[PDB]
Amino acid sequence: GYTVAVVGATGAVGAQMIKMLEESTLPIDKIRYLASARSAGKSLKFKDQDITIEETTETAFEGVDIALFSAGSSTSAKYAPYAVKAGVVVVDNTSYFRQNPDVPLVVPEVNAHALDAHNGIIACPNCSTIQMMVALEPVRQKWGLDRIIVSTYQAVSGAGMGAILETQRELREVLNDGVKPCDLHAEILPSGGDKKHYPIAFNALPQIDVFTDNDYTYEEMKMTKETKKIMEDDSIAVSATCVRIPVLSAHSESVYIETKEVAPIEEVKAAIAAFPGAVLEDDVAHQIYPQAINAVGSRDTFVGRIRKDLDAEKGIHMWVVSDNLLKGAAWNSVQIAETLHERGLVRPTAELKFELK
Amino acid sequence: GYTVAVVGATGAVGAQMIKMLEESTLPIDKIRYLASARSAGKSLKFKDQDITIEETTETAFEGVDIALFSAGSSTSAKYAPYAVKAGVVVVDNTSYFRQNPDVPLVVPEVNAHALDAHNGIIACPNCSTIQMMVALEPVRQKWGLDRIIVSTYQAVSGAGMGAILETQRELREVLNDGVKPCDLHAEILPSGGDKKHYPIAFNALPQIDVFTDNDYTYEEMKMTKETKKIMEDDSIAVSATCVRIPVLSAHSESVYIETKEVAPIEEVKAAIAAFPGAVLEDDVAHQIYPQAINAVGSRDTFVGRIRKDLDAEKGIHMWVVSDNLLKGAAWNSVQIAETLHERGLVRPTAELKFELK
Ligand SMILES: Nc1ncnc2c1ncn2[C@@H]1O[C@H](COP(=O)(O)O)[C@@H](O)[C@H]1OP(=O)(O)O
């Protein structure tokens, strides 16, 4: 069996990582929970056992076979290269290593093969990207992809535990204490790292992450570049608008594509249904489409509202929904680990290609 | 001075029709509030005055100069033709007359000229369509419009008063009582007419109105058909995805367009700023963009996140927000009435062009 480590166990994603590891087929001899110095000493369950939380340091990875990181891009930049030096395979849920050519960026159903040439770090893509890739890969395979335009309806759990609490408290202040929404005080959303902060209660904020030089945010640009890397095609045009909405869990996405060849809608429905990790929920006559609340707690990516464009020959609209902390993060990460084990890729790496900080 | 009736005066829109009339420049000698049998005999304010609500009948429109209808489609179909026969000019908020060729479909900033040839009924377009028209008309006027793809983020007040109450209590049940969103009992949303009803609390429901035979909903197809009538151009390609989110008031829209000539973004921003009824809110360096919660209570239509597509040379993305019950309904309706008075168009129609039911 393996010794597995969760770095960032106490967080929103880390807690889903525990839940997914508990339900995993991965044979674990020893489980460790890692976090910052304040969390060290507290107890936290793995199945029925009590586990002690430990400080994350440069020396804390000896004897570790697999480490799942979800502790923000700062904790991965500092500590992940040391884990690799110690003989760990790191699966990173943060954005830091995602655009490194030495790091495979992986959704198991789409680009499992990229895992074979890993140099110790495997990047988990952005949650909004992952569900889109699940929904679109089966179409790409049969008919090609010319362009994607996507608008997202993203839940607040992606922004961390604090965002959930902020949202819930804003909603209770409006509903119980009768506070105008434009009078609410916010501390986190739209982006903890940015200068100004706005309420999300009864609102739709068209900022996720911070702004880049081209006036798209880092989230939208991650959707663009991560798509090109996962599907291994730099010629796919991707433009996105990323919006936060008053949902705790589950991202929804309105997706528009143009294929390389015309794709009969019923063949598209069938192709998406036949694809692992994607579930067709499309029966408009009985008002069946994917819904965020129904997706909560499930590993699948649910797709419906599939219909052709009213004017573009090759254009298709659809609606994609997934638990953002499961397939969007923790399940993707654990599925990567299960896949690493399937393929005999849980072993030390010989050449370190990631400078130590 | 005019005798003005409000049909549907007790509803969510009707309440905003009252507020817009209260703040109008229109010379009003007499106000009447019409609704159904169940509100008949109740009282309601116009400024300091008490106004007894009357049941709408076919003979209730004697003496009325202007009638603002917002009582659902069946009510406009049944009574508006009798109002016209009596000598009223009708501003209809509903969809029933929107596609009749004898009926101007008007957003005053875009197509006020079409008021001149009215035959006793002017249709106010759909809420989500109006704000899109205000944002794009200044772009269309300078550079043309080849196509529109739009994804909406729509508030629940457009589904009426019962929908608002249903949203509020669903959220209260989740937040105060511990009820899981899965276990919520809905009666109205996503669409009061349809067979099945889903919770909107912490959800995103990709259905507004009922489905049509092409798998687009009636709401999505209205964006399409109204856009073409208002811009007097059937060659403008339009496809929509209309989604309800947990907001009480203020629609937001992620809008993609392709223009006929390249439109430098700095010129597009300028042209939108110069357009009556459109306000440019675009300064990403200071995180400035339209937000539903800020738009509430304003007649204006707010436009930001303006940026060129990453690949398509004529493509442009933007974010458009407006109060759905103001510019999207009641202000548009009162602004139509003010425009009619401006142009001496408030007068009886001789020839009856609408069927009496
Ligand atoms: N420097 C750090 N070293 C290890 N873990 C960290 C560090 N900084 C933050 N974390 C962990 O990352 C997660 C933050 O995401 P979230 O806001 O959802 O909790 C937490 O588990 C947090 O642990 P801790 O609770 O000890 O601060």
Ligand SMILES: Nc1ncnc2c1ncn2[C@@H]1O[C@H](COP(=O)(O)O)[C@@H](O)[C@H]1OP(=O)(O)O
């Ligand atoms: N048959 C009808 N005749 C006239 N008005 C109607 C009729 N049915 C509904 N209405 C009015 O349409 C508006 C519905 O608005 P909303 O959808 O926001 O509840 C209400 O003012 C309602 O009046 P009433 O209050 O008497 O039911």
